[PDB]
Design a protein around this ligand. Structure first.
Ligand SMILES: [Mg+2]
Ligand SMILES: [Zn+2]
Lengths: 90, 166, 126, 261, 53, 53, 50, 319, 293, 35
RNA sequence: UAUUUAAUUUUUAUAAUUAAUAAGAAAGAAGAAUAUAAUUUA
RNA sequence: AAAAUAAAGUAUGAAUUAAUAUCAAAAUUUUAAUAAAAAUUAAAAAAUU
């Protein structure tokens, strides 16, 4: 029983509860008949130059749950023949 | 089924709304700690505890009744006066009582949530004040009385219903 | 020698030196129920205070609570609190058993099961 | 110290010391322009940053951001104050071109909408100006400098009269690069707030704003800066401009220090 | 750079030498002839309480 | 002897905190007006007779 | 190369001073006239409180 | 070796990450805000008199400003800029009721014209007022009075001509004419061709639509009403040296610096020999950064008359 | 070296952007900071910019120079055209491995005379048994792969129950793979062996001869996709019959495993063509092999 | 480490693949290319 | 022998939201023992 | 370091040792000489080898 694992002992269930309180938003944005995944804006400034003058890049990856729900639900199409019949060059 | 891929089904028929709510109160989903407790003198924390070296990864926090209960609260969460809740003007009075006792029975406290309780009770009195003028029976008193018993149980006593019965 | 673990009184707002002047007490209590405590002067040199009773003060509290909750409605905590004010005004006795006990024993009213084993207000020989 | 899902990107977490182990904050420690400084005012970051674009603070920095929901790619901005169908003139700016020519400082794409026909201008004007301190008047693109003072107006102590005539004193003094035959002084009869008028090779005449409490070098530098603006302006007409004997911005120079022993 | 004992022991040796502030620590920098650089000796730019008094 | 009078002081002080003052003034002006209520008694009044306190 | 859009001369084929004040166009920022509107500065280009 | 706490990086590598100019986890508590308000010599005024609006700016109320005028008309310190500032303060009142507020503008006008023979400021100001009051022929009349008087109509005067020509509901080519005449005159210096730049001006004025209109900056009426700015350490600059709220005996000193002649440094020029270097200056905390802003006597109102209508609420004074 | 370049958050602002900096007004993106509609909240010494000829001309030049020279600027197209979801994002995609068995040991030669000691692994039945996303938190998703079909009476009575609930045939063994949302495959998917390309490097987790071990670099040698073997050039310290958990080694020192030069994986799962039937197909013609090391 | 994935072993099922057949098959492929 | 470390408490379907640098019915042999989960076997 | 021998075992059953409270884990300074003595912060479960 140090400081920190007692801290998380108490607070991680509270973080879970708090994000549950975050999930109910979508829920009354469901119940009233709206169906929308709340969108995340695309950020055009991901390319930058720092003080030592070199190229720095930021990676933003956006997960689409309507794609995921389709991804798990049905098979992918047949693997193209360029893939397995030719090896991966080392 | 009832939340993600078929959101309309609970709103359409209150019957299974109450049935699901009561089953969900019967197993106690909001105190999983007593799923693992063999002696009530020593309450077991199996559900609420995790350590980083891996104890209780399998018995860890299972969101179980989370989505359901939050959803079927938010079906009753229409506080907007623009449109009244669509199921509550669909329910039988006895049904209103039984789903109030549903909400009152699910929570670990044994007390209903304020918005829900207010909503249902205020929806009930506006039916009682209507139906007492029309065709009425002694059984329809049973509905009212075991409404007031729940109303006392959750600790907001109704002065109006009590002064109706007395 | 050990570190002192006795309880410490909270700091209190510093005086502006106005208090130093006589006829100005350095206790400042001007509060909601203040005007109701009426001071009378006894022949002894002692004083005589007239105050509203216990249940009157708590009834005032109840009125203020209801009057703040008329707008947004009454939340569960408000419900429980109003219940307890309402009980302690009418008390006439002392309460020694947990408030939840009655609810725990009466839970069968709330959650009804199938009708085979369903429990009623009379049970035996039926 | 990585556990759980690790992304194929080569080093994202390496700067916070190789781990993913907190990540649930929306709030970090911040210098100016860092995240939670959205809501505070600053000169630089009011015009240099969008206040949706503030990421997390110091060494925990976003190299990799994974969020869920739909993407909004909002369309790029369309450029103001030009009609469609308009055919601009195109320029080639290069590092090959040194900074000594005005061909570095102007619009790269050049429309006919942005070309003033007020002045004779074939190509539009520049957007960026060079900055130095002009210690002296040197004849740049000017052909005449007229200084008109009415002596009737009289004052004791420091006054604008003193400033303008100090402008003159500096113009005609021994160390002034300005050729001293083209500085003209006029005594006027009726009560003139002394003005300085410089006429260029365009026939255009500029009068600097002699302000209350003006001094000698203010007018000098005003004249010189406006002289640059006018060199460019005349350059817009198609005049062929001779190179300046003295360079006020030292482009071709380095700061040189004297020796040791 | 050489660390002077206090601010009084700090002089400007050349024509181009300047007084500058290194985070509340007064110092002298010459853009030419860097051997003229002088620091006032004082606390580190980053110090905690237990770590530095 | 010290622990317990510390407890008593704490209770009377918090009971004064509910009224927007504290032990620090209350002691002085129970001294000034010559009331002579021992702090133990002030605790008894704070807990069993809030109106009198 | 390593150069940013700002400070880049053309797309055709710093630590010592972190903050800037934004530049108005060259012919605009040489003498920049007052125009009273109701206690604001209005130009063809910029606004201000003054 | 937790690496969330004690990472594998040397202190030499890591000491760049120590914030010395720290922004968000702020060092100024709330209790100080009022204190640091008092030491700067600022005074809390009632809502009628003025207030610190949404940008924490102290704006002086109209009908408050006019009373300040009517007390200070003949005062020695009252300069000709104070008059035009007063008139500028009266403009929303000018629009929302032109009948009873143009009389005020004319009072200031006549009084100004007899305290000083004539001024450029005053004519700009009142033709702006007449522009907002939508009396256009008044604008031409006034301009003719300028030219007849020997006054050279200013660039601003032409912008006022354009404004009056616009919001009086009169067509383009009556504004266009003002712009072209103004640019022939050598008042407006426009770098672009006439058409596009007139487009620019009109596009600025359409953003600036009036106090009575449905779309415009001036048409926005909401005002954060505060007696005190809710951040006292607020910044117009970069550094803490450049803070927005400075002491009054400082704001005397900078005004003294402004209205005294330019012998050391450049006025009007874009060079500015002394370059802004906030990062170069002292970075460190003073004892008032710890113990709080120094205590000064709270600014008090002696012998104020009793508050009649204390129950009544002040209406937002935009009228 | 083993650190990337350090860029602070303060340092990303209009003057540091590689491409033109864009401000977001929320219905529209512009290059001018949003001018607040309430004019009285304008701060002093602030220029509200409605137009700038300096920053708009560079944008003007940039855009045109893009459409006018599309062949030079194709990398610039990354700015305006982000990859949509799925579609095998090189940096964002993590797929699952499968559960093998250490079958036997063998020896091969490459093109030159070189003795290799191969270890041959067997992939008896690999099916996606379970999906677990933990409370919907991002980057938390697992796919559970089972192997080695096993009679009804084998497992303890609580294991069989699990398999009955899933619907998947009863397996000897299950292992979880953390993966990204795009890499999902439906429950009960038969996994083939050529899910693993013969050129790649594989992460291997197995039991030592007696704790768990992880080998993070090991290249694939050869694949029998008839008998569902896979060959590897290593001698493991492991009992024959040990269940071995496979994964793709997702980065080798700054280099991604999958890239245009090196190659591309069959992404969520491999699927066989409809026209092939392995019951007609011999062992030798069923062979796949690496390029020479 | 005592978990189920690690402790359980597949020995008993090894008749499901012909080990001896594949070794000889790659012997054939050894003499076909001539190692 | 006390502390201290290291291992174990005898298959955990599964592992890591944090600390520091993880656990389902039971004991003979874990083998019916000569490495096949029966080499046909009276 | 391979080979031979010996350690869970049923039965018998000693000896050194013993001021102790269910114990005394980690760090810091102090105190008349290690200081398992103080104080403070802290973070030592059970059994077996
Ligand atoms: Mg005693
Ligand atoms: Zn030097």
């Amino acid at each position: 029983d140090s400081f920190k694992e007692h801290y998380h002992r108490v607070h991680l269930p509270r973080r879970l509860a708090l994000q549950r309180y975050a999930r109910q938003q979508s829920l009354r944005n469901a119940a009233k008949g709206n169906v929308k995944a709340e969108e995340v804006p695309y950020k055009y400034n991901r390319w930058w130059v720092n003080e030592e003058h070199e190229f720095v890049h930021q990676y933003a990856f956006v997960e689409d749950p309507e794609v995921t729900k389709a991804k798990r639900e049905t098979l992918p199409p047949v693997t193209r023949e360029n893939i397995w019949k030719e090896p991966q060059q080392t | 089924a009832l939340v993600r891929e078929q959101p309309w089904r609970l709103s359409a028929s209150p019957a299974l709304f109450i049935q699901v709510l009561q089953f969900m109160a019967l197993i106690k989903v909001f105190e999983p700690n007593k799923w693992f407790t063999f002696s009530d003198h020593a309450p077991s924390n199996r559900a609420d505890y995790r350590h980083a070296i891996g104890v209780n990864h399998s018995t860890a926090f299972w969101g179980t009744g989370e989505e359901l209960y939050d959803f079927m609260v938010e079906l009753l969460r229409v506080e907007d006066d623009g449109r009244i809740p669509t199921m509550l003007d669909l329910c039988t009075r006895e049904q209103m009582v039984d789903l109030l006792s549903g909400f009152c029975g699910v929570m670990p406290c044994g007390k209903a949530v304020g918005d829900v309780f207010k909503t249902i009770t205020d929806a009930f009195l506006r039916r009682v004040r209507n139906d007492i003028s029309g065709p009425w029976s002694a059984h329809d008193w049973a509905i009212v009385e075991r409404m007031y018993l729940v109303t006392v149980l959750c600790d907001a006593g109704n002065n109006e219903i009590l002064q109706l019965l007395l | 020698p050990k570190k002192d673990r006795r309880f410490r009184v909270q700091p209190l707002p510093s005086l502006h030196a106005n208090s130093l002047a006589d006829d100005t007490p350095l206790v400042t209590t001007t509060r909601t129920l203040s005007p109701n405590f009426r001071a009378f002067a006894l022949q002894d040199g002692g004083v005589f205070f007239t105050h509203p009773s216990h249940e009157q003060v708590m009834r005032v509290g109840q009125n203020i609570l209801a009057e703040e909750t008329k707008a947004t409605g009454m939340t569960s905590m408000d419900t429980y609190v109003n219940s307890r004010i309402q009980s302690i005004i009418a008390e006439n006795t002392v309460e020694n058993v947990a408030l939840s006990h009655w609810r725990r024993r009466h839970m069968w009213n709330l959650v009804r099961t199938h009708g085979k084993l369903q429990r009623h207000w009379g049970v035996s020989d039926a | 110290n990585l556990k759980g899902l690790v992304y194929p990107l080569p080093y994202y977490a390496m700067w916070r010391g190789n781990h993913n182990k907190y990540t649930y904050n929306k709030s970090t420690v911040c210098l100016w322009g860092e995240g939670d400084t959205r809501s505070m005012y600053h000169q630089h970051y009011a015009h240099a940053k969008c206040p949706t674009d503030y990421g997390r603070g110091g060494r925990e920095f976003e190299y990799l951001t994974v969020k869920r929901g739909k993407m909004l790619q909002k369309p790029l901005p369309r450029v103001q104050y030009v009609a469609e169908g308009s055919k601009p003139v195109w320029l080639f700016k290069s590092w090959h071109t040194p900074l000594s020519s005005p061909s570095m400082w102007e619009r790269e794409v050049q429309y006919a909408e942005h070309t003033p026909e007020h002045i004779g201008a074939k190509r539009p004007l520049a957007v960026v100006a060079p900055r130095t301190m002009h210690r002296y008047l040197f004849l740049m693109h000017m052909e005449k400098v007229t200084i008109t003072v009415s002596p009737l107006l009289f004052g004791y102590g420091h006054t604008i009269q003193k400033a303008v005539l100090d402008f003159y004193r500096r113009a005609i003094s021994a160390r002034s690069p300005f050729p001293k035959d083209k500085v003209f002084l006029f005594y006027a009869i009726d009560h003139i707030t002394p003005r300085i008028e410089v006429t260029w090779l365009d026939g255009t005449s500029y009068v600097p704003p002699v302000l209350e409490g003006a001094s000698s070098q203010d007018l000098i530098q005003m004249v010189m800066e406006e002289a640059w603006l006018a060199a460019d302006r005349m350059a817009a007409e198609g005049r062929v401009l001779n190179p300046l004997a003295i360079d006020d911005y030292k482009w071709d120079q380095l700061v040189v220090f004297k020796k040791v022993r | 750079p050489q660390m002077v004992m206090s601010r009084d022991e700090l002089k400007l040796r050349c024509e181009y030498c300047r007084f500058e502030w290194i985070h509340d620590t007064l110092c002298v920098r010459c853009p030419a002839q860097p051997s003229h650089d002088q620091r006032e000796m004082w606390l580190h730019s980053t110090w905690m309480w237990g770590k530095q008094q | 002897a010290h622990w317990e009078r510390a407890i008593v002081r704490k209770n009377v002080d918090s009971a004064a905190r509910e009224h927007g003052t504290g032990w620090q003034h209350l002691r002085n002006e129970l001294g000034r007006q010559n009331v002579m209520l021992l702090p133990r008694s002030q605790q008894l009044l704070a807990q069993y007779e809030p109106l009198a306190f | 190369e390593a150069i940013s859009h700002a400070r880049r001369v053309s797309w055709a084929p710093f630590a010592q001073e972190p903050y800037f004040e934004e530049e108005i166009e060259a012919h605009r920022k040489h003498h920049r006239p007052d125009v009273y509107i109701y206690k604001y500065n209005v130009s063809p280009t910029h606004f201000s409180l003054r | 070796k937790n690496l969330a706490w004690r990472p594998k990086m040397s202190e030499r590598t890591l000491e760049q990450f120590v914030p010395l100019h720290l922004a968000f986890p702020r060092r100024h508590p709330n209790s100080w805000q009022e204190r640091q308000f008092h030491l700067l010599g600022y005074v809390k005024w009632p809502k009628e008199i003025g207030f610190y609006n949404a940008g924490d700016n102290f704006e002086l109320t109209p009908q408050a400003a006019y009373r300040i005028y009517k007390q200070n008309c003949d005062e020695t310190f009252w300069t000709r800029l104070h008059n035009e500032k007063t008139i500028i303060h009266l403009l929303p009142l000018v629009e929302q009721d032109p009948g009873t507020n143009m009389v005020l503008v004319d009072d200031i006008f006549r009084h100004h014209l007899k305290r000083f023979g004539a001024d450029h400021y005053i004519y700009n100001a009142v033709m702006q007022a007449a522009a907002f009051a939508k009396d256009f022929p008044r604008c031409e009349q006034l301009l003719a009075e300028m030219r007849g008087l020997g006054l050279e109509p200013n660039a601003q005067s032409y912008v006022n001509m354009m404004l009056g020509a616009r919001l009086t509901g009169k067509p383009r080519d009556q504004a266009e004419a003002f712009f072209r005449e103004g640019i022939k005159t050598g008042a407006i210096s426009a770098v672009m061709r006439l058409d596009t730049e007139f487009q620019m001006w009109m596009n600025q004025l359409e953003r600036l639509g009036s106090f009575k209109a449905k779309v415009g900056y001036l048409s926005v009426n909401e005002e954060g009403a505060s007696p005190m700015p809710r951040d006292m350490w607020a910044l117009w600059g970069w550094h803490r040296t450049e803070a927005k709220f400075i002491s009054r005996k400082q704001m005397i000193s900078e005004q003294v610096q402004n209205r005294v002649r330019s012998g050391k440094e450049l006025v009007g020029t874009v060079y500015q020999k002394a370059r802004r270097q906030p990062w170069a200056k002292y970075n460190g905390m003073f004892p008032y950064d710890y113990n709080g802003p120094a205590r000064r006597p709270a600014a008090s109102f002696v012998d104020a008359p009793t508050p009649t209508h204390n129950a009544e609420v002040c209406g937002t004074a935009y009228a | 070296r083993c650190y990337p370049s350090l860029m602070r958050e303060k340092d990303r602002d209009m003057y540091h952007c590689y491409y033109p900096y864009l401000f977001d007004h929320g219905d529209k993106m512009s290059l001018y900071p949003k001018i607040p509609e309430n004019p009285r909240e304008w701060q002093p010494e602030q220029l509200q910019t409605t137009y700038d000829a300096i920053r708009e001309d560079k944008y003007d030049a940039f855009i045109r120079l893009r459409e006018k020279f599309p062949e030079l600027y194709q990398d610039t197209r990354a700015w305006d055209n982000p990859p949509p979801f799925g579609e095998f994002n090189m940096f964002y995609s993590v797929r699952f491995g499968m559960v093998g068995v250490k079958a036997f040991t063998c020896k091969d030669y490459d093109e030159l005379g070189n003795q290799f000691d191969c270890t041959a692994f067997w992939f008896p039945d690999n099916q996606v048994v379970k999906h677990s996303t933990r409370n919907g938190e991002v980057g938390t998703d697992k796919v559970y792969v089972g192997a080695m079909n096993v009679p009804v009476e084998f497992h303890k009575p609580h294991v069989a129950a699990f398999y009955k609930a899933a619907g998947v045939p009863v397996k000897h063994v299950c292992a979880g793979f953390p993966i990204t949302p795009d890499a999902y495959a439906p429950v009960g998917t038969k996994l083939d062996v050529r899910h693993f390309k013969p050129g790649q490097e594989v992460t291997i987790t197995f039991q030592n001869t007696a704790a768990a071990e992880t080998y993070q670099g090991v290249p694939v040698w050869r694949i029998d996709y008839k008998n569902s073997l896979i060959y590897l050039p290593t001698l493991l310290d492991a009992d024959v019959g040990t269940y071995v958990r496979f994964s793709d080694t997702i980065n080798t020192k700054g280099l991604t495993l999958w890239n245009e030069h090196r190659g591309l994986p069959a992404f969520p799962t491999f699927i066989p063509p409809e026209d092939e039937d392995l019951s007609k197909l011999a062992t030798d013609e069923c062979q796949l092999k690496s390029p020479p090391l | 480490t005592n978990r189920h994935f690690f402790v359980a072993r597949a020995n008993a099922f090894f008749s499901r693949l012909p080990i001896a057949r594949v070794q000889r098959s790659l012997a054939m492929e050894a003499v076909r290319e001539g190692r």
